[PDB]
Each structure stands twice: as C-alpha cells, then as structure tokens.
C-alpha cells in the first residue's frame, strides 16, 4: 500500500475524509506516518505537526525527544524533526499558525513556503514571505536559523535561548516566537517563557491554543 | 442499496462484536459503503452512532449549505457528520434517536424517540420524526417534522426572513423549537433563543456545554 | 508477524502515545492505549481517571468486559489484563495527578491477574520507588469486588461503602475506581483515594494504571 495509499492530508481530503483528526499517510520514502489532518480550517487538507491546547504535555525537551517526536494523538503533541523534514524535503509546502487566546481571540498567520532541513543541517528553517493574519508576522525573523534546544545550543545568542526562554525553537537572538515554551495560562510575569507570539498578544501572554500545520501549496 | 451482509453494519453490531468502548470506528452504510463513525458504547446500554457533537465551543457551526452537505469539524471535537451520511445511515431502516444534553452545573438530560430519517438533499433533508418516547428534556420534537433543514446560505422555514440568520444555527426550520446547532454561547445569555437551545431543558437562555445527537436501530 | 505489547511498538518507532492495537496471547487483536512518553515509555493502559465524566460505580459484567471511552475514561476489562498479563512478567506503574498540578507515581516489580474463577486475584511484586508511596502491596492475593458480587474481608459490601471496585480486603488503603470526588473531600475514603500519597480525602485529577514487560 505505499502506491495505493495517501501522500499528503490534502490527498486524504480529496478523498471523501470531511472530518478532521488522525490518519496515516505515506512519506517520500515510502515510511507510513500517522499525522494529524485538520480538515476544517481554511479549506482544509493542513497536516498538523504541533500542539499545545492544555499545558498537559511537558515540551522543554533534549534534542533526541525534538528529533523523535513526543506527546499524545490525544492532546498535545510534537511531530518529531526528522517527519517534518521529511514531509517538506521534497516540494514546497505553505505554513498557516493558528492561535487562540483565553479571552476566546482567534490569530493567525500564514506563510507562502516552510522547509527544515535534516539533522546534519541541524534543522535549519527556510521561511517563504509572509502572505496575510491577524497575528502579524512573527517568524520572518527566525528565517535561516537553525533548530535549538537546551542540550543543543545553535542560536546566535552568547547564552542559550532554550533555557533563557523555557523552550526549543529556531532561535535567533533570542527570538520573536516562542510556540513550543511553558503553559504559562495567559498573561504572566517571568519574561517571554510561554507560548508568545510577539505581534499577538506580546512577551507576557501565553495563548491557550496553538498549532502549526502544512499543506502542499 | 440494501444491508451489507459482510462486515459491520453499525455501531450496535460492534458492540454484539466485543468492542465495548466508546471510540471512533469504521461502519458499512447499506451502500456496504464505509464511513467512519462515533460509536457510543455506553449510554443507554450501548450501541449508538452519532452525528452530532458540541463539547467545548472550538468549531463553528454556523456554515453554509455545501458545509452541512458533507460534514464538517473534528474527530477529536465538535462535529456534524453531514447530511449526505446522515441520510444513508438512518433512511434505510427502522432506527431510534436519542438526544444527550448537559448543563454548565454539569447534571444529564435526554430524550429518546421512535423513528428518526433524513430524506436526502434532493428532497431537502426533510425531517420524518417519529412519536417521542421518554426522557428528561421534554422538547418532543413534534414540529420540525415535515420541514427542510435550513442553513444561513438557503431559505425554507415558517418564516419569512432567515431563521438561519435570526438565530445563528441550521436545523430543520415560525420559527424554531429546538436550537442544537446554534452559537455555543456560554451559559444563560441576554441574546434570545440563539444558544444552544433545547425548549423545555433550558428555555432560550440557556445554552447547553454538552451535546449529542446518536442512533441505534430501534 | 506483528506487535504484541506498546513496548514493541515503541520499538519500531511509534513515538505518540495513543490508541494502537496489539495482538495478544492468542492472537485476538486487542486495541490499547499506549503510553510512550512516561518514564521511557513502552506502556500500557489499562485504567484512566482524567475528567469524572464515566460512572465508575459498576458491576461485575462491566468490569469484566471493560467500559468507558478512548476519548477519556476508561477501564481495559479483567478478562484482558489477566491476557495481558498471563505469562511473562510485566511490571505495573501507577501514574497519580492532583488538582495543583502535582506528579506522584508508583512502580511495582510486577503486576498480574488470574482469570475469572481465580476471580481476578491480584498478583504483586515488590514495591521498587514511587513518590506516591506504597498502597497496593497491602492488597496482594485478594479476589476482585464489585457492588454486585462481594469478595472482601468486611461482614458488609466493601464496594457498596466506598463506591468502587477493587481488590478489596477491610478495606482498601487504595481505591482508585472509586467517585471523582474533585479535590479534598471531607466523605472517607470514597475518592480516587491512595493512603499514602494523599490519603483517604484526596481525590485525585488524573489516574492511570499501566503495563510494561519488566
Ligand atoms: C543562511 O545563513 C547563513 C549563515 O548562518 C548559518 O547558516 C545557516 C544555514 C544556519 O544554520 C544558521 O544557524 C547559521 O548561523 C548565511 O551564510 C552567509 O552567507 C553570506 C551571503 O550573504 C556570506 O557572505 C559572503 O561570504 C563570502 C565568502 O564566504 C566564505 O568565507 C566565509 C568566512 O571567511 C565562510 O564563513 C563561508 O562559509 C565561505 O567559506 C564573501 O566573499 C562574500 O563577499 C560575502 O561576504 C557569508 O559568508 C555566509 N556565512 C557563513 C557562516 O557561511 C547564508 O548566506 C544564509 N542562507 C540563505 C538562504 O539566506
Ligand atoms: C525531557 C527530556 O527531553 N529529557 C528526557 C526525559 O523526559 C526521559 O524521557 C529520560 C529517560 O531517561 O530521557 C530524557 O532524559
Ligand atoms: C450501571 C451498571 O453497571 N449497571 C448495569 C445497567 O446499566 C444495565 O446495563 C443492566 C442490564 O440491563 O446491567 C447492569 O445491571
Ligand atoms: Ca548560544
Ligand atoms: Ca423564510
Ligand atoms: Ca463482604
């Protein structure tokens, strides 16, 4: 079933699957992979590789945990680096976020083309421009940048980002972005350690919903 | 099309079956077509397929013609099974409908009833009920027999206007008795009859946290 | 020519904990929730306490063929974990969270059940850590109790008293079946209860038993 099956979640809409939620697809390499499809949002066919809805997952992990995967079909979860990569390798992919404030605030931001490249490149981001969202564009910045978590130090910083901002990201200098920090439930005081996206809600908010997802473009 | 004599027909099969807990299975519609359905194996003894759920106000029920036509939301949420399924999956047969329904205080209300069909889009996805039979909730369901469900981007209703719009929702509209698929709007609400409203559960101002809408074979 | 455990599953690179299915003693598939994130992962579930929304006040035929959803609350069935548990010597953890947020575990050398005529008698190991204490061990080789079919020490109904269902003796020091009581609760012992981790008016906000080949 590697030529029988389903490639991408937009391939599984086409099919006939209206409803959102986990299915298995098939990567470049014939390696099944079970993803999450968001069905429902902006036309639909978006595979979704991470999210944060409760702060029931702990996401301030070592490299290896980044680079596998971890979480829940659940709840919370993050793909893994190596299946991100993959699903974006070959071909050119566009990037929605979508966040969701406690107050009830629907964000978002898009991207016209999102690509990580594989571990020897330490999971460097290639960005495309900024098309449209409500969010503003907070990750233009953390273009060309490599992947970072605390036990693996890559940013541009004299110090670690990881641990200066609870997290792991394609951290810069340190950063603009932060979707992978600490459940920190709306505003808080210590400095830009949640889920903050700067042009959002700012440096002391941390949203109560976030996901990134891709759909071949 | 008629009953697939070769794999499971319903939720109430798998349960005969031994899968006893409630969870996302795969049916074969009297097509012997599959779907991949919510199989509630716990309440009222078990057996149930829903179409309809709201939990937690996520997604947004207020769509369009096309959008109800082929379901819409999330496995892992709120979602409408469409009606297209919806239709293939009651009008082959005799099957009930049972009707869950929970207040924000977190008490239980329901609401079973004899026959439950969709015609299908052709005739409008007419409603045929059938006599109420028991449960705490009252909303028997009598009116909204006979009558097209209407959605935002249609009309057809016992109202000249858009019931849809009036009220925010789609349903099966002088003007509406029950409100299931209305604006999730947290609790009693000031704005009349917009919520998700059953009539004799929580009037109109009262909208519901849970919400179900399943079926067994009766 | 497939996975019987979520541990051979870990193995071959699943890394999200969910719903998979395995393959057990004999053969029949069984679907399970795997649990790969704690503690290494490769576990399976076979109890889960998350929200209050299951009635876990049940009896023998529903504890017996296991209820509940994969959407939330569950347990796996008697006649399943005694298959899961049969033969090669599994260890249990139990995984414990309260209503501030706070993780207390347990971890037992090994974990079995026998079968319905031995009435699912518990089968323990020694208590190896956990900083939720020991509260199981005091339960080791007793029958199984639900309100409809009394098997304890107590001249009354153990099950009927503390609302639950277990591998009740005189009665529990755990009873983790037992009401969502939210919270510290001023009622005895009829939580989701574990003596020495919050003791008898702690009700807890999370719950989970799970299985690995030890
Ligand atoms: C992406 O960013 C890199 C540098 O950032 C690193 O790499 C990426 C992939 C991430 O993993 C980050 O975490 C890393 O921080 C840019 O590299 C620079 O590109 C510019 C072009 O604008 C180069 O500027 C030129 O360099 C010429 C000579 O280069 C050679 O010598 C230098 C040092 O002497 C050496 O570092 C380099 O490798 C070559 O050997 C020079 O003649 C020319 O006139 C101009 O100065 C700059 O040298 C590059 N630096 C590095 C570190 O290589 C990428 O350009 C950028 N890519 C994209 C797509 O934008
Ligand atoms: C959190 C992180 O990335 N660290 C993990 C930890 O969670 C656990 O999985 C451990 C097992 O020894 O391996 C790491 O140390
Ligand atoms: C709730 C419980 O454990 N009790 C059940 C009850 O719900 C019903 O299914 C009955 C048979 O009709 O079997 C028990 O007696
Ligand atoms: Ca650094
Ligand atoms: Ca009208
Ligand atoms: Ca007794």
Same mark, same amino acid.
């Not at 902006?42 to 999210?51: A, P, Y």
């Not at 971890?70 to 190596?82: A, C, I, T, Y």
């Not at 330490?122 to 421009?129: I, Q």
């Not at 959002?200 to 908010?205: A, R, S, V």
């Given at each position: 079933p590697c030529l029988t099956g389903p490639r991408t979640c937009k391939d599984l809409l086409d099919r006939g699957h209206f409803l959102s939620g986990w299915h298995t697809i098939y990567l470049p390499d014939c390696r099944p992979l079970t993803v999450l499809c968001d069905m429902d949002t @902006?036309? #639909? /066919? *978006?595979? &979704?590789?991470? %999210?944060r809805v409760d702060g029931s997952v702990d996401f301030y992990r070592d490299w290896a945990t980044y680079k596998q995967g971890?979480?829940? %079909?659940? #709840?919370?979860?993050?793909? /893994? =680096? @190596?299946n991100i990569h993959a699903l974006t390798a070959q071909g050119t992919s566009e990037l929605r976020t979508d966040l969701v404030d406690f107050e009830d605030n629907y964000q978002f931001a898009k991207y016209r083309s999102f690509k990580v490249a594989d571990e020897a490149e330490?999971?460097?981001? &290639?960005? #495309?421009?900024f098309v449209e969202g409500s969010a503003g564009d907070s990750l233009t910045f953390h273009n060309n940048q490599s992947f970072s978590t605390k036990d693996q130090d890559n940013d541009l910083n004299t110090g670690n980002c990881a641990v200066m901002f609870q997290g792991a990201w394609w951290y810069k200098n340190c950063h603009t972005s932060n979707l992978n920090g600490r459940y920190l439930r709306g505003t808080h005081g210590s400095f830009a350690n949640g889920i903050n *996206?700067?042009? /959002?809600? /700012?440096? =002391?908010?941390?949203?109560? &919903?976030s996901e990134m997802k891709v759909r071949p473009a």
């Open positions: @902006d036309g #639909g /066919g *978006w595979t &979704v590789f991470q %999210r971890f979480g829940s %079909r659940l #709840g919370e979860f993050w793909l /893994g =680096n @190596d330490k999971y460097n981001l &290639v960005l #495309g421009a *996206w700067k042009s /959002g809600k /700012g440096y =002391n908010y941390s949203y109560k &919903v």
